[PDB]
Amino acid sequence: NRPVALITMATGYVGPALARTMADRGFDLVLHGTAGDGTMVGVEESFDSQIADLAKRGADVLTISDVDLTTRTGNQSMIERVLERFGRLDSACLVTGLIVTGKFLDMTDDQWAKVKAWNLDMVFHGLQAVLPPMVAAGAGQCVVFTSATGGRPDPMVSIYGGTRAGANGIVRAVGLEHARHGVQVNAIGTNYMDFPGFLKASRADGDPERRAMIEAQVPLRRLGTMDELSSVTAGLLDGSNRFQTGQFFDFSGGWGA
Amino acid sequence: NRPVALITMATGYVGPALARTMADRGFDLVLHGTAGDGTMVGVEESFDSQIADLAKRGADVLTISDVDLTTRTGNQSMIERVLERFGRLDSACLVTGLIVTGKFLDMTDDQWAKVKAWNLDMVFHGLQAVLPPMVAAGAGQCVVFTSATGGRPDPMVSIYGGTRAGANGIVRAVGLEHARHGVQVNAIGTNYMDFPGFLKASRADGDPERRAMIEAQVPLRRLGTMDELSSVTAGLLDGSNRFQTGQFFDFSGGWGA
Amino acid sequence: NRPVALITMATGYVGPALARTMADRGFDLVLHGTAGDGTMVGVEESFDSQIADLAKRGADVLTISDVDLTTRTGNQSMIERVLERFGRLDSACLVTGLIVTGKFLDMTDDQWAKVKAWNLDMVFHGLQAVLPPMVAAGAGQCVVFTSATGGRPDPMVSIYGGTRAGANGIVRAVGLEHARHGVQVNAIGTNYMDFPGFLKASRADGDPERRAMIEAQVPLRRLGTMDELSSVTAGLLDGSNRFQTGQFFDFSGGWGA
Amino acid sequence: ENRPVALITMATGYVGPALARTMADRGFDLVLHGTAGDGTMVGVEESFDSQIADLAKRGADVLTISDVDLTTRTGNQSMIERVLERFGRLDSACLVTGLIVTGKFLDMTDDQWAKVKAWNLDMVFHGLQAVLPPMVAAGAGQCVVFTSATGGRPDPMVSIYGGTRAGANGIVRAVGLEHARHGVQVNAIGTNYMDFPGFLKASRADGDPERRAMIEAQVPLRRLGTMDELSSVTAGLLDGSNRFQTGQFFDFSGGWGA
């Protein structure tokens, strides 16, 4: 009678570390991500490499990689495939968004459209899919990953930070609206995290001297670890804390405080 | 050498009262709005009605009513016709949005698409159209109307309140990004205002019993008047205050405090 | 039968400019401040120089300068003397606080005691004195000046900015608690204002070298003027806007956005 | 053999006992400040004697303190001195503060005003001035200050209590950001609607099922929080597993403060 957790974009970012700790905590897993080995773009840990490790921890695993999570059909199909394999959905970690920066007056209609599809549509369709089975069960926990820029939309990041703020707003209303059914929905927004996504976007991957300058912008003078982020994320998904919902938690070393 | 102020949706809501006071402060006016007389939907004070009154106050008027302000082409066309008649743009008041409410799980793709086009696209394209001339002149003031729900997006107002929070987010980044050019951009969000839009949406029109119940939800126990709102709004557009930018102001009788 | 406005610390900061425009708007005035001519510390415009100008604007004036506004007795006696002369109290502007900075671990018990007395006690006793007559009249407007550091208490400003935040919190509850009696209470917090107080605290006197460094810290690249602040302050005290209460407005050229 | 040390105040009630139990499971030695006496004394939910026995089976040494005034500089300085004398190190500190008062704003007296400042602010000011120097000198430390969820939404009938709580949160933000460069963290947690005697009697929900249900109906998640839950979240900010958050305030009230 093991509980089931869903994690998306799990071939990178916090997915791999989160899966390990959720398996240690007694969960079966459903991992959505990119197919192929490490050479393919956006693949930090392939499906194959993870399955061996997670099985030793005692978790059954299902993989999904042929859905478009910016649409209703992609998210509905993902949850349908979850329920037929395991027949339940206790927790869900929805990783969303795509980074874009630049002057506000240089932004194009394509950039504006891409920001809306990844920062808002993924959240809207994602939540409309995971909530029904949780409401029907009378219990559930969801974490939506947005961005720390949503708490302080700054110049040169207007359309990206601005839409992240709207995503946090949606999570507040949704987390409050379904609380009476025993369901929790919260948001986490990170920045200055140590992984390829942030390193490339901040032009820090090339020069170690530029890395040090970027670290000097964080109050705690370092970049975050995925093991740290997974421990925090799991705390909102493992059933140990059922008294927080509709809230946004900043995770950027004090940058967003 | 009168300055020029642009007001959109000016055939209703705050437009008419704002135009009158702005004319008293020595402004020329460009009014976007809806064509037709009082019997057509969405018109509270027709163009013809305001022309005669605005004339005695000493202001010239240009009307625009054949443009789609959810598009880039529409907003660009609007500003081109402003610069053509008067050759300058000193202040801009952009009214945006369209209300939708209901359970989060009942929302359709059409509702989701409609709220994005009115609450976000109007803001994106609107600002990309009014700023370039202000930056060129080295001075400008802009007010974007969003909604008090952006400050506290609640159950039954998930997608409307959440996207309003994103609009406020964009206005913060933009307001701070163009401040060094002497331009100001701020947002105002209202609720419980006495005008047809809110009265119908709350099912309070023609129902004195319902009206009293609605007013009892407001800390100050009343509905707001357009004369009050126009005075506050004109204060951010008449040149008297030039030390605020990128900020959001709640105007709901304490409801959003 | 003119209305009566009360203004404290009125021999400096926003007092004199606020009294001038409030008189233009038809108010009788009661001014609390420091006695003496420009020689004494903390007096920018003496009582004598002002009463002649304000009388030409058509207002009666009452002066008070022998009360300790960190105590219940001082504030109670101030309002008692106001009702004795005019029998009426319509608006009140309570200027509070005294600035302290430095490392948190270098703060002494006297510094801690002083920030509490000027940032908090003044607000507690001030509001307990002005509200009773406004409640009994069924109408009233109050503005409490705190500081923009209350919105973002930063390092080296711990106990000052921290206590300013507590003052804003008190204004929120009080502003919401008495809204049903037709009374309004809001707060304004400034920074980077052009007046002797702020200039001395930032070592920017007759030294354009550092004042240019200070001005670059503001998004709008300038310092605010009391005529600007006076216009915003008067808007919340002249009866033109009765739909905002329990709110905090930042006025630092975008520094606090 | 080289166990880290954690300080917990007001540990005879509220979250102290449960937090002590899990921090011991995670390998900490403990210094517990609290009230002397058994369960018959007011303010003692779990007595010192009863905790030392259970904490012992978990492999933790314990020091107790109950003769200091934590509203003063002398009390807090004395407390930290006795920590370093016994263990020679301070790794984590959980400072419980404050005292409840409610009622109409215009009915508040000078004694009530003086009381909230001493418990909601002075405890925080003097508390942090005593726990930080050891952590800065070592280059590592974690601190949690318990304030109140009302600090995030100071409401009518809670003016001076909620307002001063918002001030404590502001102080925690500046301090948390000011010492981040030294490798030290300071954050705040603010609760409401917790299942323990302090809240049950302040809300008159004790012994009355119907009133207990009406109180729960004010919580979005329609329940009261347990100390096991709160101690799990609190320990996660004091056990070295998360070192990337500082100067922040976290609401813990079932969504009430969201």
Residue numbers in the entry:
A (entry chain A), B (entry chain D), C (entry chain C): 6 to 262
D (entry chain B): 5 to 262
Article excerpt on this structure:
Halohydrin dehalogenases (HHDHs; also, haloalcohol dehalogenases or epoxidases, halohydrin hydrogen-halide-lyases) are biotechnologically relevant enzymes for the production of chiral epoxides and β-substituted alcohols. In their natural function, they catalyze the reversible dehalogenation of vicinal haloalcohols with formation of the corresponding epoxides. HHDHs possess a catalytic triad composed of serine, tyrosine and arginine. Protein engineering of halohydrin dehalogenase HheG for thermostabilization revealed several residues with positive impact on the apparent melting temperature.
